[PDB]
Design a protein around this nucleic acid. Sequence first.
RNA 1: AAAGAGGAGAGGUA
Lengths: 227, 227, 249, 689, 49, 16, 438, 65
Amino acid sequence: MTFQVECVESRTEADQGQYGRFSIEPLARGQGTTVGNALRRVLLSNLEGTAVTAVRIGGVNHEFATIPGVREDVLDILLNVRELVVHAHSPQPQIGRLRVVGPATVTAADVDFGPEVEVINPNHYIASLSEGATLEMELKVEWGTGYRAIDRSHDETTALDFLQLDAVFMPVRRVNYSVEDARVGESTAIDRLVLEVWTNGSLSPQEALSQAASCLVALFEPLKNVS
Amino acid sequence: MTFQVECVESRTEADQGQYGRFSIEPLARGQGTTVGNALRRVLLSNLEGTAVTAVRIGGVNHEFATIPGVREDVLDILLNVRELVVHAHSPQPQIGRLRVVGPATVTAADVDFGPEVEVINPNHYIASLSEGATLEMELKVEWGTGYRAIDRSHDETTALDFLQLDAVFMPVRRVNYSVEDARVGESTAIDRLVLEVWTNGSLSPQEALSQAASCLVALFEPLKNVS
Amino acid sequence: REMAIELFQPFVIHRLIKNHSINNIKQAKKLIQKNDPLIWDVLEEVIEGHPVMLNRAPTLHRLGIQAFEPILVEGRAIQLHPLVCPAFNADFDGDQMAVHVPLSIEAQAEARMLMLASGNILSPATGQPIVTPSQDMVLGCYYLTAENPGAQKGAGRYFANLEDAIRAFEQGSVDLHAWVWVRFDGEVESEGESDEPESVVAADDGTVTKTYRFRRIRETEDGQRLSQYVKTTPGRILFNNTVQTALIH
Amino acid sequence: RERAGFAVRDIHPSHYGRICPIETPEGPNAGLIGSLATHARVNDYGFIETPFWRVEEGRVRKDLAPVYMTADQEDDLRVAPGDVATDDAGYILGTTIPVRYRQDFTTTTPERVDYVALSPVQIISVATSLIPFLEHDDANRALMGSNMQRQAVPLLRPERPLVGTGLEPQAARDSGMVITSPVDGTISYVDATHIEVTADTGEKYGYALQKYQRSNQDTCLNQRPIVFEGDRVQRGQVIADGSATEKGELALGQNILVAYMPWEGYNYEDAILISERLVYDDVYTSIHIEKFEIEARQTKLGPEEITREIPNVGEDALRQLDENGIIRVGAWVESGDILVGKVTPKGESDQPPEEKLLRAIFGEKARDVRDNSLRVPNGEKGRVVDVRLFTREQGDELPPGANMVVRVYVAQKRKIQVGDKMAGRHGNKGIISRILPCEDMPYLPDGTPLDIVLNPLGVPSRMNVGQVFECMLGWAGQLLDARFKVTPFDEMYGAEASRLTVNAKLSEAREQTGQPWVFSDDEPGKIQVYDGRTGEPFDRPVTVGRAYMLKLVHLVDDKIHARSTGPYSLVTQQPLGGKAQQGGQRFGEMEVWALEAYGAAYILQELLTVKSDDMQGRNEALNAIVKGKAIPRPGTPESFKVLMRELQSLCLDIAVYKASTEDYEEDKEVDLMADVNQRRTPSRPTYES
Amino acid sequence: DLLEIYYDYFREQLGEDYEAALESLRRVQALLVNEVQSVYQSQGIDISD
Amino acid sequence: ENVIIGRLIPAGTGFK
Amino acid sequence: EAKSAPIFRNRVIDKKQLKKLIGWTFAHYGTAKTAVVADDLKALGFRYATRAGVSISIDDLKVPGSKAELLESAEKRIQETEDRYTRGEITEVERFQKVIDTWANTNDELTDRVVKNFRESDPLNSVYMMAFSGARGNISQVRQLVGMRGLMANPQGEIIDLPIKTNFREGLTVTEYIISSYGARKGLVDTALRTADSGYLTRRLVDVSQDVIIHEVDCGTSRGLFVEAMTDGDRILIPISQRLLGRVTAEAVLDPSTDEVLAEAGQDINEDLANRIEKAGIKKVKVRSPLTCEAARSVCQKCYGWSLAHAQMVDMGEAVGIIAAQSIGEPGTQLTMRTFHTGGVFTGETARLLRAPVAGTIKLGKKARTRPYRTRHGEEALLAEANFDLVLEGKGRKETFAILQGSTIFVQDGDKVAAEAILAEVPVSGRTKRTVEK
Amino acid sequence: FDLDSQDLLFKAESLIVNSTNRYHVTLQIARRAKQARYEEMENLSEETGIKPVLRAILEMSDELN
RNA sequence: AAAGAGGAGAGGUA
Ligand SMILES: Nc1ccn([C@@H]2O[C@H](COP(=O)(O)OP(=O)(O)OP(=O)(O)O)[C@@H](O)[C@H]2O)c(=O)n1
Ligand SMILES: [Mg+2]
Ligand SMILES: [Zn+2]
């Protein structure tokens, strides 16, 4: 109604993540709790992102699940792949191929993710290789929301060609909010809302806040035409 | 984002309250709670109304006195007239007058407020008078929201021999809601929200829903610009 | 505020005379009695940095008097931190407390450096802790880390870092008492853990996997570890993450 | 008290049925003051009797004029308690009956019994007999509940309990505020101060009612009508009631919704969290009345006068007075307002006599008087409801040496707030720590928010589980509109009587209302509850019911006190003691031990000298603080000098000496009662210039 | 009387009475401390020595 | 004894 | 302040674990981190206590289903005793003692069964959860809630022979309420009448030692005191590691295994050194004590040792007499005013029974010297005069027990003892209580 | 303000740790605070928004470096 | 300029 929004502090972490703090004031006695809770609920579970959904590793023995020449087995590679952050500019899925030979340390910068998909952190550790070893991998990306778990496959799978992974499409990593007194002098009750957002990097906190606010406005708009 | 809202039941109690049930569907997996809790919180605290804030009785100057011929004392009469329900069509305050004589049962039906104020329940019991008794009264009406306590700081004694009252402007009595599964064979986790409103009588449930939706939209709109 | 405006009168008078030049003492006293709004702004900064002493009636040992830093509240009752109640032996069902104010600089220094309530950790009678969580914090920490054969949803999942488990819990995809595997490198103690490797599997290129009741370790040929996974519960992860985070700030 | 032994504070076997074994003070005189039992009576010699029923061959004769017996008459007979169960009020069932013989508990066959007690509650007093489900509690909690039931405040609109015991009407009737119809007639005239009853024959009876009077403890006494005009009444029907009674029954508290669960630390140690509906619905709002007095004496210098012309005061301080100078009825007064204006003609001599003699010779008579009028004390406000004036020439018996007396009455209304004490009838007490808006409290599946939240941690530690029975019965009572009454010691009819009764009532309520969520079979007493801040249900169902709660006379408004500087004592010159006279707090020797154990010497030294009785250091410290400089070093306290003078008065040669630094010179006595610095020493600290 | 017994025995056994007094007092002190600590430990009270 | 006459106690900060 | 990483505690966290964590944090990081750690733990516990929704109900109080048979056996035994007294074979004192012992043993067995049933049936019960997590309750109150109250005591401290066989969930009768009134009166009188003794004692203690202040650094003394563990027979009541913390050694400490030296002369003992000393044997240690200080004042800094509040050596200028006096005098005064928290129940303390695990025959020994004896229950038995060994032989199992001097034996050589039969009893001691007239 | 009480608590703990007697360091802090207050009161105005004891603690902790 | 002085009973709260 008669409030103002300000941005206090912003940083960028080593892993290319982002952090943001916002202050909103003034509001009525109880409006801070409702605004903060609605914003948190919409931010944490109703935003769109990209994630790696299927992988395929070449040169895998079905017993001992161990790659020759690589110090990690299949489980650690699958766990390291799930943390890779991507940002696609098209609604159709794309595929990516990785081929590494010789003694080297594989990194997310060595994945050919087409001409449009981009890799936010090009320093993501994947695996290590020694002399006389090669790594061949295929990755598939998709669109979705939230933490999508898979069936019967916790992590440990070694069988069919394309392995299915449980993915997490969540641009926003953490949200906190607090309500404080902003009376100033002696008068009716007035509060101020402080909101902190940790984002994985593919989005900026201001953009996420704008998207959540737009979603809430679209949700509540068609309810005032009943009278 | 696109859904249907419909009214299922509408009934009236003994000319002193209203009931309404609404169904909203379809929604996402967890948006039913998000919509319902916000609607409940806004409906129960952030609505405007009208109430009686000052009373003047001829022959009485404080609240611990009695009138010869009246079955009740001033405190009971003040408590009775505090819970009178009115609706005003204009933002300016009005003044209502009452005069009753003889053996009678004084109810709310004999208060002349003028064509700018309407009395909801005309069977509100107020007082009883025996043969040789008379009752003369004047009432003041104002706009506000929530609970207002008397302050003895208006040193300007404009309200001479006026007895101030603690004011309660809350036109909504009860709100309830529930969430059901509208999934039909296909596994997609579609929600349906059912909302029930018990209203004081000066407002119909549809108007209260529209006002709450407008307030929520006005709250969440200014966050779409920058952050 | 009613108590504070009376206990700190000379300091308020001095600050009213020095800053916001009034005139003399009589005008300041008239201002205080008339209750001008400015005196509250002056008092809010008069008391900043000035300790106060609190006492309860039966003083059985030296922990019955303690020094605190005051903040102004609206009401007529004193607010007390829950973690200092057992030392005072006080509960909130009718008790009362006494307040004293130091005057000189030496007294203020002694109150800050000898009796401040954040430095009384052990008991003079026996060197045992005295600020342990007492009644509902214990119940909450017990419920958080307990066991529940029922309500096991999302059990068997694999996680990296200690933050992925928390993030998955906040989304409702995992229960609070489920059994999950988490990648953790460090010292771990369990309950009823077997010191003998329950299973040993030796593979090619000189690698061995040893599986215990609550652990799974991968090793090279008589060398260093490569990975370690712990089988635990999300509430225990929350507890340990809170403890670890608190020790770095 | 000092010369009393220890056998007098114990319970004797002869007390049963004559003196209550629970109600007793909890202080230095515990066990020395007692209460008469409910059924006891005193004969014409001064001994206490109790009634019994006689049995013949094994049948209780319940229609044969009960027999009153004394302690020594029943020593040689086998007497059974009041919980023995009979078939049809006739023969005694069972085969082993507990009896009392020769002041000893024994057991016997149901044919040697001689007498049976009338009631199972014959052993307790009136206050202890108002606690339901008392056999499931501890005795100490019963004593605390009986004690706390007598500290409740009458409320604006009282309510009688849903779950009672059956003794409330007699307790209300036997105290003298309930008016009852003495005939079988009709009602002819009703008014807020008068009721008339006309019988069938034709004669009339009239009653007048009290209206807003004062009690010994500044509470309120008020009577209100119950009946209407033209109503048909009977004999013994109630037509009016007092301030703390419902329609014929005692009513001390209110019935409110309660849930047993912890909140976010606001129930930590017996603290209470309540809702805001209890404030704006005028629940737990009370009325208090206070009295102020003033007199006009006649001094040797001249009589004092009650007038309006008060020297050296503004016009805004005399708006509400009238002609004589007495406040008007119906005015609102705050602290510092003038109630009665009194002026004293006094000839003080504290000015040079030249101006006074010149004025006296010249003339121009003016005001040589002083102002000591009556003003309301700090922290008080309210309405003036009564002013009474007594003088001579009116047939009034004034105290000797006085000419006029004025009395003023002031009334106030008080609501519940943070820091007030609340309690129930089962020994559970607490202090309110937070008041919440109703949209933040937990709510039911119906959508109704709760009224109060209590911590369960305190139920098994205090061992008072009757409150759970009471709440679970009150829930069903509210759902059914039934208002049950239960008599204690109800397990003589079965094995699980209370539990089965509560379960049956709850099941009947569930069937009648048609709502399946009000009662559960897996968790009989538990319901699902949602969170008003986020809308998410809690993990497990909690216990919900209706509780009868009271508000006590210990209010935080009469407990907050502070001091900077005030009066001092005449002899020791130490600060006075007491709330009523701006007193200081005592620093006993245990606190001195604690400060010595800490190691803080400067704090202790400043406490002992500058802040208590160093007559010169007080003003130096005050002026140094005001000017922003350092506080000079202290001297010698006055109490040491007083002690030295007192010791010298006993013909003892005690003095302080200074050691000789060098040479043969002997040590020199020091004069402690001498002035060292040429500076003033006034009686009280003051701000110079 | 334990002190007297110790004093007599050690005075006969040793040469001087300084050492005898020291020995007797030491033994009595140890006995008293142990007795008091045991009585306190009978309940649930823990105090340093 | 220093408490009765009002001097610095010989323990703690008043040791010397 | 750093360089130590916390361990991952994969277990349930009760009050003891929290206390251990607080002690570890103080010992490793300092007094400034501990406050923030405690604040964080308090906030987490407060946040997650309300999510659970812990409540109390009538059906939450579970009573074991085997109470009636236990009670019936108790009544049979009591009736046997009363018949024996009526016939004229025992006096009144022996009957009183026998019935008291029988009821005490019955109550002990009942509470053991209650605990076992509560643990086995449902571990998430609210009463169990908030009683056995160390939150507020204790066993003596759950016993009265779901077991049985037992025997009472009157204000003079004597036992009443009529027990209360019901609990609070079932409801008392009139006689049992009358009996409970005595315990209520006992607690009421104890709270305000007996508190003067503790105050008088602490005032005397403060007065006797108000001038003991640290004035000296070292006195140069070789004298000291011998410290060992506190045991009762073969059970250790107080270990030696707890008693050695903060003390200064008066002589060098040598390992009984090798020539290694664990500590030198004039070395304070921290926790790790005390643990090392206890783990490697060592039954006695000589330390510096204030009892043997040679300072010509009160005590020196070297003969005192650590200050327990700060975990390091004392500072010069400390008033230790006041601290000692108010450390001794506080717990008794505090415990006197908490008597009413348990009603007036009698705190049991019975003799130690030796039971035969399996059936067999008794072999006895060769140093066994015994005399005819009459026990306190009115029985004929044998009193031992020297320590010996009892041999119980079975089908394929042979066991030996050690019998000390003064204990009573109920069997002889050659008898055929059945299973779970009493063989010997060690009676309670008379010390730690004051002796009065008969 | 940028200076919270937690930093002062850590600074006081550090001052206590790096000394042999707590009473002596308390007396030193009191003397420094008195001298600083006297210097302020007779000259200039200084950053008066901090009490002299806190100032003395800050300078004494900074001298440790 | 002024303004309370002690004592004795009875009853309560932590
Ligand atoms: N004669 C007395 C009575 C009470 N007290 C003080 O008041 C406390 C009594 O606390 P109270 O609230 O009455 O009982 P608790 O034992 O705390 O139990 P609960 O609060 O659970 O009822 C005692 O511990 C003590 O500090 C005292 O010093 N002397
Ligand atoms: Mg208490
Ligand atoms: Zn020494």
